[PDB]
Design a protein around this ligand. Structure first.
Ligand SMILES: Oc1cc(F)c(F)c(F)c1
Ligand SMILES: Oc1cc(F)c(F)c(F)c1
Ligand SMILES: Oc1cc(F)c(F)c(F)c1
Ligand code: SF4
Ligand code: SF4
Ligand code: SF4
Ligand code: SF4
Lengths: 441, 416
């Protein structure tokens, strides 16, 4: 298997592959099902209406007391049930309020100046010295090497398409401490202005007009654990990867700053990761709505960093995902909430949670979120059943690579089974080896 | 290999009745007799500020290390930018202050604990007390948390620092370096790890230590003493910090307590030897079968019942007896060519244990000179096996190497 060959074979000519029409407007982040008032509240198993994640907490507690690893899924014993939720909770250690979405708060600072690392290194002046490299070719190789050190399994570069940057972010006022954060969330516009550096005022989050590029990282989840979806070990690989995302953003932003440029971290905030990942060539959009990659299918998390560092954009990739999703529909048939459409792509949002004006499969994300308190987790059944999540999809016919169409026709064993560092799989880890030739052309 | 070379139970570190616990302030990094070193202009400064001055001089002169020309100034800058960034999740080079910043001895105030409070995992008594099942659970968690190697030992208090270097609890970060103080670490009959005005208190119930190996990148370490060796060192310190926090939270959410440490609290090499990760060596590092000495260590202390691993003997002592390659290549002649003794060469060694006694002030003195963290000893050690070619060459996630990553695969059989 040769993952670099595969990406070269399916590379497209330059240009955003996302098809849009005149109804396209930037999307206010509060509209996501996690944050919008219509979807935020969900009943728990006693019928009490609560913030969805508190209702899900109630189900986790109920499952542990009943020796279960998920909905109607008996564990080996209560201790095993406990252990899965302890692993899940611990995975979130470096993530604020399920996704790090507040810009320029906590780990997501838009300047490095107050960070303990920046203060310690201040005598060297790396963040104040003008860049010594302005060549986009060399910078792309340097920043991608740094990205791999920082924990990305995939990395790509695109020009920043502002259509996918949230029109307004969900955040908290700068004087609000963490313990009041969930009670004091506000909206704040993200605007683009002729300023030298990213800056936040009382009224606006201001991205400079010089912010040309977005660097997108893929953070691979663990296949054995995700295949337990919707049960607790799928929750644990999800959670650990959010902390890996946070570390990636902070590491990479510091590298970029110490190279003489500015950098904006984001994790789940600032803009729509799937669209950036498609434009940076990590993969293609899919029926479930995730970015499907050749190496991991959709079983990969995304984060991204915005910067004025000159870079060479990667080419988008077309390995036939759209045509497979047209005929496959496994995620839609297996979805426990029937949130995923079995119909064609349109430009018309299904509800407030979708951004209208771009051609995509339109899914009902209030239905999806509704299953999370019911199951006490983050589901993931769609990722688990997608044939691209299997490690065995690619075959070579003597001339070229192709997808094997035959692919489209318990938790105790996970705890007792194969694992390796960060949940990566040495049987496939060669797929993400990188040399200069595949970092920049 | 690890099963083939398992020893019977029992600490393999030979001691005499002279041995006493070692005050952390005695390390060359911290002690007043070794802390101040001249820069290249002759100005005496804290040694790491003099090393900063050399990094700046090298960038200006288009160098990646001492008398090592870079491809250009841009390349020199990029190596130091990568090094500085690697340290993002590490306080003041090593996270040594206990119960400060990332190294909290309780999870109660952490943002993650607060968010998860309604589930009550940290307040609920353990549902598992079987050390066999716990050892399998916690080692699985350790691999998720970024350890390439993990082992368990009973806690030997001889390797716990008698007094830690820390700061007063209300001193802000901007004043930390100027207000470092000593503070005793003591063991008492208390329910939970607790810090008073006077003492860091570890419970007498704190039976076990979990030791993690965090693998460095071979291509980058082989550029020692130049900048890319500094970068793999730095990134692994941030990996250490995330490992400690992740694992401590897992242990707490299982109903036990956990003390993180990174480079603080105690001597990692001794813990790693007792937990079976590897053997002590002439250079002083723990040499592992998978990585040689090219691996960083961190550790977590806990009352969670666990099954101790066996120490390992794969012949490092006898190999180091005749090798002496690190000693001949050491740019500061810090590593001895003589035999092992129980007598330290200076304040920086803990006397009373059989080891190769090295002069660690000589080692530190080379760091301002070279503008880095050296590492030549690690780079040349047989067990471990230009900068433009590294930047243009092979890399993979976290610097791990897919040619060898199968060596750290793990199933239950090898976890307990
Ligand atoms: O983006 C996410 C937000 C959440 F609240 C979750 F629980 C989760 F697993 C992912
Ligand atoms: O343990 C370390 C301490 C330091 F100050 C360094 F710069 C490096 C490693
Ligand atoms: O000479 C000292 C060095 C240190 F690191 C201290 F913690 C201290 F109190 C005295
Ligand atoms: S399961 Fe099938 S339809 Fe759904 S995303 Fe995967 S390939 Fe597309
Ligand atoms: S996460 Fe679960 S409920 Fe949501 S779309 Fe996927 S399968 Fe459906
Ligand atoms: S780090 Fe360098 S100076 Fe220090 S002991 Fe090793 S070779 Fe010698
Ligand atoms: S270089 Fe030789 S003597 Fe030194 S630590 Fe390695 S094997 Fe031992």
């Amino acid at each position: 298997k040769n993952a670099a060959e595969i990406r070269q074979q399916f590379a497209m000519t330059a240009g955003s592959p996302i098809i849009v029409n005149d109804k396209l407007e930037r999307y206010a982040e509060v509209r996501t099902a996690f944050t919008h008032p219509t979807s935020f509240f969900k009943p728990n198993y006693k019928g009490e209406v609560k913030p969805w994640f508190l209702s899900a907490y109630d189900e986790k507690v109920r499952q542990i007391e009943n020796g279960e690893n998920g909905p109607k899924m008996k564990a080996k014993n209560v201790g095993e049930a406990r252990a899965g939720r302890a692993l899940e909770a611990a995975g979130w250690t470096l993530d604020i309020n399920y996704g790090n979405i507040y810009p320029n708060r906590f780990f997501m600072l838009w300047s490095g100046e107050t960070m303990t690392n920046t203060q310690l290194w201040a005598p060297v002046g790396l963040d104040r010295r003008p860049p010594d490299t302005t060549d986009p070719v060399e910078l792309t190789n340097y920043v991608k090497f740094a990205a791999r050190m920082a924990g990305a399994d995939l990395v790509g570069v695109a020009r920043l398409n502002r259509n996918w940057v949230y029109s307004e972010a969900v955040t908290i006022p700068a004087d609000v401490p963490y313990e009041q954060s969930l009670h004091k969330e506000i909206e704040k516009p993200i605007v683009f202005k002729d300023v030298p550096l990213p800056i936040e005022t009382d009224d606006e989050l201001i991205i400079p007009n010089t912010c040309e590029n977005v660097i997108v990282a893929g953070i691979a989840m663990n296949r054995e654990m995700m295949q337990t979806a919707p049960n607790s070990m799928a929750c644990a690989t999800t959670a650990f990867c959010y902390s890996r995302m946070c570390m990636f953003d902070m590491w990479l932003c510091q590298f970029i700053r110490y190279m003489g440029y500015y950098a904006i971290p984001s994790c789940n905030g600032v803009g729509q990761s799937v669209a950036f990942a498609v434009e940076a060539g990590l993969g293609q959009a899919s029926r479930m709505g995730a970015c499907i990659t050749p190496e991991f299918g959709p079983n990969v998390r995304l984060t991204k960093v915005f910067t004025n560092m000159p870079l060479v954009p990667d080419k988008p990739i077309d390995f036939g995902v759209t045509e497979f999703c047209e005929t496959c529909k496994k995620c839609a048939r297996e979805c426990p909430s029937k949130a995923i459409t079995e119909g064609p792509r349109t430009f018309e949002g299904r509800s407030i949670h979708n951004q209208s004006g771009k051609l995509q499969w339109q899914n009902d994300y209030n239905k999806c979120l509704g299953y999370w308190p019911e199951s006490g987790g983050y589901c993931g059944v769609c990722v688990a059943v997608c044939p691209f999540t299997k490690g065995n999809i690619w075959i070579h016919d003597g001339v070229e690579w192709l997808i094997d169409n035959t692919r489209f026709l318990n938790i105790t064993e996970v705890w007792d089974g194969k694992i390796n560092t960060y949940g990566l799989d040495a049987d496939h880890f060669r797929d993400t080896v990188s040399f200069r030739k595949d970092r920049v052309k």
